[PDB]
């Protein structure tokens, strides 16, 4: 992955003119610094390996966190799967229009002790359950629901004190690639919903406790971390400049191009 | 010389005395769809002479305080002859595109336009909590124009049309990453874009998905000394390439 | 059970790991590939595309288009300075929010030569000559046309080709430089000077303009990815 180097030159004077170009044709010129001044023939050994698409993307990042309280009615958390709730990853993925990649998933779970009232509480080890529901499946509504059977729905059980769990999901989409932008409506009358929210139908995620409220309540907190593999991208995009506003849409407030200086000649 | 192009498709031809080179997409040419790629169970149709001719939209007048105009591309041709007929009668379809914008003036005027085409161009509403209606996104073969100021918040469903943010909240200086061309009145006279079909799905319905958007932004304001013609228009010419259809259903 | 010892460094979670994981979709059938035009495969393909830099930052043009226009008019005397700004593609605000400046904000280290394309968007009957000068650091910013010609420069004359390019070469004591502002790895300044005046005939406006572009050459390389300081988020988007 070695970058090319430059070659020496001699003093030249002819009407072969590389320096004068025409940018009106929409073509970036391919001049070399060996054509504007005399240079030395240098060996070069830099690479562009750390600038590939995979090294730019295959690094994990948090996308969401949620809580739930043990000693409560319907203490259980849910979250619709989307990647436009955190400003760091959403801004990174909006550099490309069409993405097709493999996905890897990890979790990390902490806990906390609630201000209870019982005397000399001491809890055993707690375990947690994460169940994925494909779009169209049944829904849970309480902590002891028959939806938690996990008959066919893939799920995982995890214990505190051990390593964080990890699973891997292959490329699941109706089309050929995930799309970061969709300019259209759902209805053929061109009404109602407009934007990326129409395609965003991938399922939901439910977390819940396994054990019971023994004597004192416990509030936990999970965090979900995405990490892509085998990435392929198409149609690069200029980066998002202004701040993000919403998740279902792409609305924005107007802002200047950059911060300003005091003069056009100042330094 | 290299200044002269001659573009002929079907029954209509466009020639020009001087213009720059033609910029062709992302390096490919528009093609028909091969058997290994298809998912339509039925055989498509190809009119291919009744659709691969040129069309002309409504011309707009370039003024001094002009902000910029746009069109949603496979929507403004929905009344343009048999292509407008064939768009109404099918369920699927994919098209290529050739775009040729032209605007002429004397050697005594000044100004430099920018013509870029963007695939998958979302917009933003005035009120942040809503999305704008259909009629503000495009007109039938007419231009929607930008403003050099900020659209207010009191409006319900209107597109925020601040020029320096381009409606998508990006920096307009970075817009040249898409295939673009320049029209400088000092040396150039017209621009030519050739674009292939860009989508995640090999075919699409055209009524509820605009996969291409054309934008024209004046960086340098049009300037002239007194005595020349003050009324200068801008015309566009759009012709599709190798289009086809599937799923014959009623008219809508 | 094989006799093995747990090495230090297990049961950890690294932000940039690389391992294999058991799948959750057993024998999933993936949708086949598709020949989508414009497949990028390295980040330096974006970094070669030029972009218009907002030079005219005079505190009111940033919410306009006039930040990109560089005002050029006919004078009476000679030797004026058109503009000037330091060359730091990750530190200066002028080259910050441009496309090359944005990719550079995702890293720390960089090297390579930088092109500077200039287009004269004036009349056809206008004519002028210019001195596009670059100076390496070590002294101050040059102050006259005589001082700038001792640097590395080119004398662009407008003609039928209404474009020109400057290529500032890579002159550094180190193999790479920081994108963060520092005394130790400064890069010098770029200035543009009126070589002659601007010749205009009668019945022409005397106020022309020039546009600017900025791109990298083929020797460009970055290193040591970091997290960008531009966007910031407090609560969740919904």
């Amino acid at each position: 992955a070695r970058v090319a180097d430059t070659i020496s030159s001699r003093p030249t004077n002819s009407e072969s003119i590389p320096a004068l170009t025409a940018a009106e044709t929409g073509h970036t010129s391919q001049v070399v610094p060996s054509d504007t001044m005399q240079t030395r023939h240098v060996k070069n050994y830099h690479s562009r390996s750390e600038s590939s698409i995979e090294n730019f993307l295959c690094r994990s990042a948090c996308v969401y966190y949620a809580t739930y309280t043990n000693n409560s009615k319907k203490g259980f958390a849910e979250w619709v799967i989307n990647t436009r709730q955190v400003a760091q990853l959403r801004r990174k993925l909006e550099l490309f229009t069409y993405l097709r990649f493999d996905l890897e998933l990890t979790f990390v779970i902490t806990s906390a002790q609630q201000p209870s009232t019982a005397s000399s509480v001491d809890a055993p080890v707690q375990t947690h359950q994460i169940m994925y529901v494909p779009p169209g499946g049944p829904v849970p509504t309480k902590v002891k629901d028959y939806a938690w059977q996990t008959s066919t729905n893939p799920s995982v059980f995890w214990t505190e004190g051990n390593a964080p769990p990890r699973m891997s999901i292959p490329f699941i989409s109706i089309g050929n690639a995930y799309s970061c932008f969709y300019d259209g409506w759902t209805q053929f009358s061109r009404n109602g919903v407009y934007g990326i929210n129409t395609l965003n139908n991938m399922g939901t995620l439910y977390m819940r406790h396994v054990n019971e409220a023994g004597q004192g309540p416990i509030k936990s907190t999970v965090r979900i971390y995405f990490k892509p593999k085998h990435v392929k991208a198409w149609v690069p995009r200029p980066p998002r400049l202004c701040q993000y506003e919403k998740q279902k849409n792409v609305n924005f407030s107007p802002i200047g191009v950059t911060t300003s200086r005091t003069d056009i000649i100042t330094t | 010389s290299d200044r002269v192009r001659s573009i002929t498709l079907g029954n209509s031809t466009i020639t020009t005395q001087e213009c720059a080179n033609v910029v062709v997409g992302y390096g490919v040419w528009p093609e028909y769809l091969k058997d290994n790629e298809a998912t339509a169970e039925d055989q498509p149709t190809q009119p291919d002479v009744a659709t691969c001719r040129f069309y002309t939209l409504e011309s707009v007048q370039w003024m001094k305080n002009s902000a910029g105009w746009w069109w949603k591309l496979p929507d403004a041709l929905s009344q343009m002859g048999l292509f407008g007929q064939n768009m109404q009668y099918h369920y699927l379809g994919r098209t290529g595109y050739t775009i040729h914008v032209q605007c002429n003036a004397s050697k005594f005027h000044q100004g430099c336009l920018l013509v870029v085409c963007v695939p998958e161009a979302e917009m933003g509403c005035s009120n942040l909590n809503n999305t704008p209606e259909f009629s503000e996104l495009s007109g039938g073969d007419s231009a929607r124009m930008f403003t050099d100021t900020q659209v207010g918040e009191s409006n319900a469903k209107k597109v925020q049309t601040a020029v320096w943010n381009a409606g998508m909240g990006v920096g307009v200086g970075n817009l040249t990453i898409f295939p673009h061309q320049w029209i400088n009145l000092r040396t150039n006279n017209s621009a030519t874009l050739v674009m292939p079909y860009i989508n995640s799905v090999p075919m699409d319905n055209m009524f509820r998905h605009n996969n291409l958007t054309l934008m024209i932004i004046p960086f340098v304001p049009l300037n002239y000394s007194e005595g020349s013609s003050p009324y200068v228009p801008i015309t566009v010419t759009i012709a599709p390439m190798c289009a086809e259809y599937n799923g014959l259903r009623l008219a809508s | 059970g094989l006799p093995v010892m747990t090495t230090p460094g297990s049961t950890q979670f690294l932000t940039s790991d690389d391992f294999q994981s058991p799948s959750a979709m057993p024998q999933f059938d993936v949708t086949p590939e598709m020949q989508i035009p414009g497949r990028v495969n390295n980040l330096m393909e974006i970094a070669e595309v030029d972009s218009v830099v907002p030079v005219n930052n005079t505190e009111d043009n940033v919410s306009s288009l006039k930040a990109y226009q560089i005002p050029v008019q006919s004078n009476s005397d000679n030797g004026k300075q058109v503009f000037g700004f330091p060359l730091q593609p990750g530190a200066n605000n002028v080259l910050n929010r441009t496309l090359l400046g944005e990719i550079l904000n995702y890293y720390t280290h960089w090297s390579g030569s930088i092109k500077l394309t200039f287009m004269f968007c004036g009349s056809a009957m206008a004519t002028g000559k210019f001195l596009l000068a670059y100076s390496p650091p070590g002294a101050g910013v040059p102050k006259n046309r005589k001082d700038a010609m001792l640097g590395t420069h080119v004398i662009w004359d407008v003609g039928l080709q209404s474009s020109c390019v400057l290529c500032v070469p890579w002159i550094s004591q180190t193999h790479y430089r920081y994108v963060v502002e520092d005394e130790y790895t400064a890069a010098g300044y770029v200035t543009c000077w009126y070589q002659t005046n601007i010749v205009v005939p009668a019945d022409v406006q005397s106020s022309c303009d020039i546009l600017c572009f900025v791109s990298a050459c083929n020797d460009f390389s970055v290193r040591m990815l970091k997290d960008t300081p531009f966007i910031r988020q407090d609560t969740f988007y919904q």
Partner: antibody
Amino acid sequence: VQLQQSAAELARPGASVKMSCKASGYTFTTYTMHWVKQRPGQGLEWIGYINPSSRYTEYNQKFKDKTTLTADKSSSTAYMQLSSLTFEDSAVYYCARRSEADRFVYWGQGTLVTVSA
Amino acid sequence: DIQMTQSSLSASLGDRVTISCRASQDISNYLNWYQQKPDGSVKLLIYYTSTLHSGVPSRFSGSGSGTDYSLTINSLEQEDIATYFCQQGNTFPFTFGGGTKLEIRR
């Protein structure tokens, strides 16, 4: 990061006053800035906002004629200038920063503006 | 304009309290809950119907859907004795609720 208002003032009925909202700890030109008004026996009322990147103002329909929202990029502060002061204006004023979507995260300390004879 | 109706509540230490406010029409779950301290400081607790801000205790919780929405504190303490407001974020312009004071029982 915090928002710093000025002190309390007093003015003749019909006169004008100008307060300040000193912003520090964050980049000034990025985010917007608003102004609300709370009468002491009432709730809260929104007045208007001002984008310092473009100097664009927009009021509520109750205060379309009176207030003037000004801000300068240098000192990173904003001024809310009231005109034709009456006894309705005897209230407490806050300046606040609008969130990512619609919330108000950072709030100033509040100042008291009274009119009397 | 969206009308925001909401008045004065008293309760003792460590009990479960609730505050409820409704709108004029449906707001589709775009609600916030603020707290104005007795000295004159203002902070944000729940930036949605249920999701707490970072840095506040977990004693607070909010619920409700459609028109009717409720803010609940499970255990009352001294630092919580202030007023609280609800504010819509759906339509221009932003309308705030009325005051709702808290105080000791006896």
